């Protein structure tokens, strides 16, 4: 395989500081450097700092360097990251490579660090019902609005699962109020309509909600 | 410090073909650039580490080359693994930068979208808000626009949307996108309509409504 393990983050209010933790096996503790590398979903990595095996010299990311202090620990044999007043720019995944040269050859699983002032919601599932007053045209356009939710995920089924095929649940969005919101959508033959019953399946474990929206026909 | 790049950003690649993205240091490293393959939904992997050292397991397919300021990573022929997001890293001058990130992605025929245009739910519109939904449905490739226009007046800044990320099957994109406000607005207009445009469409499509009218 070739990993470490990571366990720290997860959603954090603002303003508010925040430590991860990079547990590693006592050779690999001393013997080789570990990097914190950083990734906001969407971009690129940014390298945030490394610390030597013999001793722990930190070597930080002048930008990181004002507010993020790596240690570790030779008893526990584990890195540390603490973010301190964070910010909603620090949403992103944390790693903590392993390795030889200037190598980060031995990635952990990364830890995901959430800030947010947003409270847990139940999403409002509403319905992407099928237009009668439409063109037949073949197939048709089922739907579930899955609106104003946190913190994700959602687990969106369609008719508990027995219809998968054509199935089209988008990634949620982070709308600026701070919720999130995404859609389920399933094309299905025009005149299967009204003959099939399509019912979605909204799960939310973080606020309990579990919504079962059934979608109808409707040109209005 | 030491901006790296790559390109091209974006790649159409099939099973058998030979995929080679290009590196660029704005410096001068030696040999202190890596690459490394994330799938979605996971950590990076070392492939080549040295310049053109390849690392454990990596499959005698990807190879690397280059020296200084001109790197490029190879992939003698692609596989389904083979289908990611490749990055780049030098790893010689303080910090260490990486590139912004290659994806390679499943080549296919050129496919327009299926438009659909979902009217708000009569029970959103008690919640104050009222979500109209445009659904572009399985096109390829990506680049794809969405034009809403309410009362024949080109809006904007007021919609979001998420895209589809490959499809394991049809290999096709899927896009949505919602043009949300408020109720007292949505009662405000009669015309909704989605005009969408792709490279696959002849002329561009739109879809519409009538707050009101069915």
């Known amino acids: 395989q070739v990993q470490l393990v990571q366990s720290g983050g997860g959603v954090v209010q603002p303003g508010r500081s925040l430590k991860l933790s990079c547990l590693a096996s006592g050779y690999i503790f001393t013997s080789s450097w570990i990097n914190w590398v950083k990734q906001r979903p969407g971009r690129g990595l940014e390298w945030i700092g490394r610390?030597?095996?013999?001793?722990?010299?930190?070597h930080y990311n002048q930008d990181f360097k004002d507010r993020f202090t790596i240690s570790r620990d030779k008893s526990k044999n584990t890195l540390y990251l603490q973010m301190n007043s964070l910010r909603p720019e620090d949403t992103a995944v944390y790693y903590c490579?392993?390795?030889?040269?200037?190598?980060?050859?031995?990635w952990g699983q990364g830890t995901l660090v959430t800030v947010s002032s947003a409270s847990t919601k139940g999403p409002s599932v509403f319905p992407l019902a099928p237009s009668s007053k439409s063109t037949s045209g073949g197939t048709a356009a089922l739907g579930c609005l899955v609106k104003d939710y946190f913190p994700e995920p959602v687990t969106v089924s369609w008719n508990s699962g027995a219809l998968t095929s054509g199935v089209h649940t988008f990634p949620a969005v982070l709308q600026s109020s701070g919720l999130y919101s995404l859609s389920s959508v399933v094309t299905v033959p025009s005149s299967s309509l009204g003959t099939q019953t399509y019912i979605c399946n909204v799960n939310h474990k973080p606020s309990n909600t579990k919504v079962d929206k059934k979608v109808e026909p409707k040109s209005c | 410090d030491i901006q790296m790049t790559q390109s091209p950003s974006t790649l159409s690649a099939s099973v058998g073909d030979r995929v080679t993205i290009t590196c660029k240091a704005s410096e001068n490293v030696d040999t202190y650039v890596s690459w490394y393959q994330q799938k979605p939904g996971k950590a990076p992997k070392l492939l080549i580490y040295?310049?053109?050292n390849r690392y454990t397991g990596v499959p005698s397919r990807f190879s690397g080359s280059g020296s200084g300021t001109d790197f490029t990573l190879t992939i003698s022929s692609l596989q389904p693994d083979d289908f990611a997001t490749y990055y780049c890293?030098?790893?010689?001058?303080?910090?260490?930068?990486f590139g912004q990130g290659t994806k390679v992605e499943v080549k296919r025929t050129v496919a327009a979208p299926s438009v659909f245009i979902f009217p708000p739910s009569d029970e959103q519109l008690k919640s104050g808000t009222a979500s109209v939904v445009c659904l572009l449905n399985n096109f390829y490739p990506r680049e794809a626009k969405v034009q809403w226009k309410v009362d024949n007046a080109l809006q904007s800044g007021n919609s979001q949307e998420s895209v589809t990320e490959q499809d394991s099957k049809d290999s096709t994109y899927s896009l949505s996108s919602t043009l949300t406000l408020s109720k007292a607005d949505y009662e405000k207009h009669k015309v909704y309509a989605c005009e969408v445009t792709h490279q696959g469409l002849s002329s561009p499509v739109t879809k519409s409504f009538n707050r009101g009218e069915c």
């Open positions: 040295g310049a053109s």
């Open positions: 490579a392993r390795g030889f040269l200037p190598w980060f050859a031995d």
């Open positions: 610390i030597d095996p013999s001793d722990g010299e930190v």
């Open positions: 890293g030098q790893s010689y001058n303080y910090p260490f930068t």
